[PDB]
Amino acid sequence: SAVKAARYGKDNVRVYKVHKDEKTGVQTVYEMTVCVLLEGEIETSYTKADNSVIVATDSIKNTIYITAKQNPVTPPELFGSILGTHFIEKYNHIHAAHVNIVCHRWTRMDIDGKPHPHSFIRDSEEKRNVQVDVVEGKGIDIKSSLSGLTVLKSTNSQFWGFLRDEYTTLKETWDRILSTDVDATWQWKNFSGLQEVRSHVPKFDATWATAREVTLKTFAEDNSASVQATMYKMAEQILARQQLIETVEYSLPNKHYFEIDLSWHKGLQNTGKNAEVFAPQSDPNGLIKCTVGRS
Amino acid sequence: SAVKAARYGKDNVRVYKVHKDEKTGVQTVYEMTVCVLLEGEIETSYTKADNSVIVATDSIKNTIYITAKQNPVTPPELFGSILGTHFIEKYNHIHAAHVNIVCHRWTRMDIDGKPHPHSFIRDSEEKRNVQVDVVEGKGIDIKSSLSGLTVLKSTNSQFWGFLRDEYTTLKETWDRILSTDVDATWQWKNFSGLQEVRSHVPKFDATWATAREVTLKTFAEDNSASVQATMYKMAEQILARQQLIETVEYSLPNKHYFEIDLSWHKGLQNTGKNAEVFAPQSDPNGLIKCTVGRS
Amino acid sequence: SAVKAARYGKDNVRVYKVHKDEKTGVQTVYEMTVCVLLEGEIETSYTKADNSVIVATDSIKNTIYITAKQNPVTPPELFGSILGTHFIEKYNHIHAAHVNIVCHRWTRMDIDGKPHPHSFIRDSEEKRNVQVDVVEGKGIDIKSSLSGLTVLKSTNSQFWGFLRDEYTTLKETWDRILSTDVDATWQWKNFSGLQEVRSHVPKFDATWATAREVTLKTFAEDNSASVQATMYKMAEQILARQQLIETVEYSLPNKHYFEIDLSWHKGLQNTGKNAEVFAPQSDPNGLIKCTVGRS
Amino acid sequence: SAVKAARYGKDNVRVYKVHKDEKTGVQTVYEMTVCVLLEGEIETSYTKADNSVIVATDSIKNTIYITAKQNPVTPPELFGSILGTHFIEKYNHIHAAHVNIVCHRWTRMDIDGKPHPHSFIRDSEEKRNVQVDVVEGKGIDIKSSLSGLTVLKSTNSQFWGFLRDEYTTLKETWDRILSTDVDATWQWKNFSGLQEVRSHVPKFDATWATAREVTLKTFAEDNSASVQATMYKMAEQILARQQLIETVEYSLPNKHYFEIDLSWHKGLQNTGKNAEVFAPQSDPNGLIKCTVGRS
Numbered sequence A, B, C, D: 001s002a003v004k005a006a007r008y009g010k011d012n013v014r015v016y017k018v019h020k021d022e023k024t025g026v027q028t029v030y031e032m033t034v035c036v037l038l039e040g041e042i043e044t045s046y047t048k049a050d051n052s053v054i055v056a057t058d059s060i061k062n063t064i065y066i067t068a069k070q071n072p073v074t075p076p077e078l079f080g081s082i083l084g085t086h087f088i089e090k091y092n093h094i095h096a097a098h099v100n101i102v103c104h105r106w107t108r109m110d111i112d113g114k115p116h117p118h119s120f121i122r123d124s125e126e127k128r129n130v131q132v133d134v135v136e137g138k139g140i141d142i143k144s145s146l147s148g149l150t151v152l153k154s155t156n157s158q159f160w161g162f163l164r165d166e167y168t169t170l171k172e173t174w175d176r177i178l179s180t181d182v183d184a185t186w187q188w189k190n191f192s193g194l195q196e197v198r199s200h201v202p203k204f205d206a207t208w209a210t211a212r213e214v215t216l217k218t219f220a221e222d223n224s225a226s227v228q229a230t231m232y233k234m235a236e237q238i239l240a241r242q243q244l245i246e247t248v249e250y251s252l253p254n255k256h257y258f259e260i261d262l263s264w265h266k267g268l269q270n271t272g273k274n275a276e277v278f279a280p281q282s283d284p285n286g287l288i289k290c291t292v293g294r295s
């Protein structure tokens, strides 16, 4: 036997950071969950009980805190790049660092129509994430995403013209509910190192905002032929609006809402044009995926 | 042996309803999860295999749908009252109906600064709930609540002057983080029946709004001496602003954020006035509860 | 306004304890999650920012650890009684202590047919719990339970003879699946204090075992007329086998498994006597409850 | 823009199947959750609203049921292979089918020391899984796994000799707790098609049993130098015992149990050799991964 692949590190590291403006009194908070996995010349820890090659996962945890103390934690693309670069530079025998960051929402509260200086609300379980892979000699590969963006439209979704054979019972429809949890990822051009990541810093927040805006507007406005057709429109628009992205990927569940035939009860009409009350289905769900790149 | 208490019904019934304005084209959606448990002269179903006294839970489910089709589902206090009243009136031997409703958020999307007619977003896992107990001959008892309202303030929370003995290690503080998930319940005066509930319908949405507004403003503005002291202020204000409530109850976790001493690493200062990076603690958590009524 | 009720403490306190037999080398582990809430003359912490009456929740946490170090953690009825008694005795102004313990399974592994001295497996998310309320001047009230015991029988469950009216669509059946998650609670006679609890210590493990055995055997062997009828049989047997219990309570979901009509596909027969493949339903679920006491 | 990758299908399809032996009366149950995603000449569904290429996800769901009715559902490697082969054979334009199956435990109950003919218990959330990728012209690729196997040993785990620098605070130890949730995957040699999968059917259950047995015995018996060293031993043994496997992969969290220093309280000794009571840590956790293949 031999080690074909190995990585190890610390997962589920919760991190909060506050910034306090001394002049204005305004405070701003950031909260994340971080995972860091390292690769390199570490196989002997597995094969020979050689712990000398192990940067302890506890030490990786310490390093996350220390790095958060001494550097910006936003945008997460930057923080992840700094953190991953640290491991490959500090340790000769560590040659890759994989850094995943889930960013949690702490949106500043408005009280009586004014933004409060130090109070925040979790508006939504929606996350902003990054996966940053820093590979020695091969730069920094960043995948940015939004996830857990849960939406529903009550009309202007259709699904007809699909294949019909002896396995098919689904009725064609020209007016259905469409609900999903959006998971959208944009893959950046490889960056050569930290300097290049830093040179593009404003683009990270701007591109997250573009992706979110395009997703919401396209979902709301597209008289959808299918989940497939709608998600493709989202992806093509995002690519058109950020040249430093190479691909956009969507993974969308179709969270079904079924009509309920009540006509057995006093002829009550609740289907088709008369459908008012529906049964949200927890499972199963359609799952529709696409990765779109440039022609 | 004998039956001392019994109730049965259908739980976790997901319900969506849409309203479509024909004139304007504006659609509005509602989504809930419902549980209904019935009580009455049903003991023989337990003791003698007498199913004749059982209104099948499947039929209870059907009835939830039918009732949602033929009645308003908002405010939930009203829907729950209608539904519970149905069971005790329809079935001579059923003498109480317990109806719990969890309302899920589907907030209308704004696209390009305009409210969209049929697209919605789940902004937050915060719920609005009701527990409605309809008891034959004893009216309708309603407990309204908000839950899952997750907030954080980064300063203007204190905790000092607590009991100190040989079990105490906690340091006094004049500046800490405070974060919680608000669960707040207001208990209405008993209503004599459906007519009286209907007569107060506007008060239900208004009182939920008051409770939420008071909670957020008090949390944001109170230079808090403790969770106890802050929650009491919330409750007293809500009672002062709705005379038809008898009590307000809060249940608040203290979701701790611990300082991280980094001074072992190059003398890095991250405690006290220099605290920037914190460790959010998943567990354990303080749990602070109060029920406040009128003097 | 005035405080009508108040309690506070520390929740979700994870605790592990190991016992090591020096002679044999056999180690035994225990893992729990504890919550402790205190009541007493504490209202001024809410109304006047008087923290002097607060035994800090952090100190309550310390006390849980210390008490676990110096006392048995098994049976949980005993540990909870010791812990709750400590708070009301140590603090003059604390008059009630509510202690909930969830016990997690760490079952000793068998390796090559022999019990291993220090390796354990979580066989099942089933829990054994206690709720212990120690009230100064009013003894110790203990509710013991098992929960999360998930079972299924593939036949010998029936449901017919239920009420049929215009809300009813459910077909009678003489052969269905029955699956549930058992939550069963036995309420002990009030104990006067710790001495009396200690005097009955062996009965706690014995009665948990009886409750579990009766539950499983009755579920397996009863040709069930309904969930109601089966659960009542369980409760009556447990009461008959422990005179120091006053009531037994069950709360059972009916976790439905629906037939799937496939006859639209090449006349495939999968209903009634030919039913082989079923659709487990995540929601909704029946919920059936009973509390049984002595005649 | 252009589609670079696309797949779609139905996820979270719950399936139960019962087998009834007419002669003996013994019934046996199987429960799974299935996902199926298809690939092929489907890009126009995304780019041109061409639904004619879509086998509806609803139809995929029907097909899962139908296939379960007409074929064995065990071992899951076989069922997944049959199901995936169906899609690529039935639909000319579908060229790959990805089938994931999570198998849920329904272990036959023993009542009074005898196996019951039709009653079952969920002993453990441990799963047995398969990922089966059927690719037209390229055979069938199967990854088998066990997951959610949660274990703890109370001694005979060590961790010393790791790298120590200015980021390191972790103390070396020669006696700690080790607890993990085992996720282990064995990757089979490519199979040319269904005939070859069928020819190896007995090996699937046998190899799952070997993997589980090796995992448990090695965990229990290895005086572990690290998670890395222990998991490697597991993998090498499994490879040695099934020549039709190419690799074994483990992903193991190190679910930390921290000592609690109580010496501030009356000099209580609870560290090192005196450690009895520990604080299980929910997060963060080490995460250790390896893929082992043949030299």
Ligand SMILES: O=c1[nH]c(=O)c2nn[nH]c2[nH]1
Residues within 6 Å of the ligand: A011, A012, A035, A099, A100, A131
């Ligand atoms: O790459 C990762 N992505 C994730 O979403 C994640 N979550 N935990 N760890 C993770 N690593």
Ligand SMILES: O=c1[nH]c(=O)c2nn[nH]c2[nH]1
Residues within 6 Å of the ligand: A159, A170, A225, A226, A227, A228, A254, A286, A288, D008, D054, D055, D056, D057, D058, D059
């Ligand atoms: O948008 C949809 N895409 C699909 O592929 C599908 N299949 N069933 N329903 C569907 N809806």
Ligand SMILES: O=c1[nH]c(=O)c2nn[nH]c2[nH]1
Residues within 6 Å of the ligand: A251, A287, D011, D035, D037, D098, D100
């Ligand atoms: O839920 C899922 N998400 C995915 O991205 C995926 N890929 N394969 N199977 C999958 N299931």
Ligand SMILES: O=c1[nH]c(=O)c2nn[nH]c2[nH]1
Residues within 6 Å of the ligand: B011, B012, B035, B099, B100, B131
């Ligand atoms: O009274 C209830 N409250 C709840 O929060 C709930 N959830 N399920 N059922 C319920 N019943």
Ligand SMILES: O=c1[nH]c(=O)c2nn[nH]c2[nH]1
Residues within 6 Å of the ligand: B159, B170, B225, B226, B227, B228, B254, B286, B288, C008, C054, C055, C056, C057, C058, C059
């Ligand atoms: O607000 C608080 N209340 C308490 O009762 C407490 N105990 N520890 N910390 C605390 N913070």
Ligand SMILES: O=c1[nH]c(=O)c2nn[nH]c2[nH]1
Residues within 6 Å of the ligand: B251, B287, C011, C035, C037, C098, C100
């Ligand atoms: O989490 C909890 N919430 C409560 O309301 C409560 N009451 N007792 N114990 C409790 N634990």
Ligand SMILES: O=c1[nH]c(=O)c2nn[nH]c2[nH]1
Residues within 6 Å of the ligand: C011, C012, C035, C099, C100, C131
């Ligand atoms: O009394 C309680 N029962 C419980 O099940 C529980 N869980 N957390 N706290 C709790 N308190």
Ligand SMILES: O=c1[nH]c(=O)c2nn[nH]c2[nH]1
Residues within 6 Å of the ligand: B008, B054, B055, B056, B057, B058, B059, C159, C170, C225, C226, C227, C228, C254, C286, C288
């Ligand atoms: O056992 C059952 N009890 C009920 O009350 C019921 N209602 N529908 N199905 C049922 N099954």
Ligand SMILES: O=c1[nH]c(=O)c2nn[nH]c2[nH]1
Residues within 6 Å of the ligand: B011, B035, B037, B098, B100, C251, C287
């Ligand atoms: O899920 C539930 N369990 C219960 O015990 C209960 N009581 N009321 N509603 C309830 N819902």
Ligand SMILES: O=c1[nH]c(=O)c2nn[nH]c2[nH]1
Residues within 6 Å of the ligand: D011, D012, D035, D099, D100, D131
């Ligand atoms: O390939 C998959 N693996 C999984 O574990 C899974 N879960 N859902 N879908 C899935 N697909």
Ligand SMILES: O=c1[nH]c(=O)c2nn[nH]c2[nH]1
Residues within 6 Å of the ligand: A008, A054, A055, A056, A057, A058, A059, D159, D170, D225, D226, D227, D228, D254, D286, D288
């Ligand atoms: O087994 C372990 N492996 C590691 O890599 C590690 N790091 N800290 N603790 C550890 N324990």
Ligand SMILES: O=c1[nH]c(=O)c2nn[nH]c2[nH]1
Residues within 6 Å of the ligand: A011, A035, A037, A098, A100, D251, D287
């Ligand atoms: O929890 C995780 N599991 C994994 O397999 C993994 N890979 N990268 N990050 C990861 N995080």
Ligand SMILES: [Cl-]
Residues within 6 Å of the ligand: A254, A285, A286, A287, D057, D058
């Ligand atoms: Cl779909």
Ligand SMILES: [Cl-]
Residues within 6 Å of the ligand: B254, B285, B286, B287, C057, C058
């Ligand atoms: Cl607290």
Ligand SMILES: [Cl-]
Residues within 6 Å of the ligand: B057, B058, C254, C285, C286, C287
């Ligand atoms: Cl039921």
Ligand SMILES: [Cl-]
Residues within 6 Å of the ligand: A057, A058, D254, D285, D286, D287
């Ligand atoms: Cl680790």
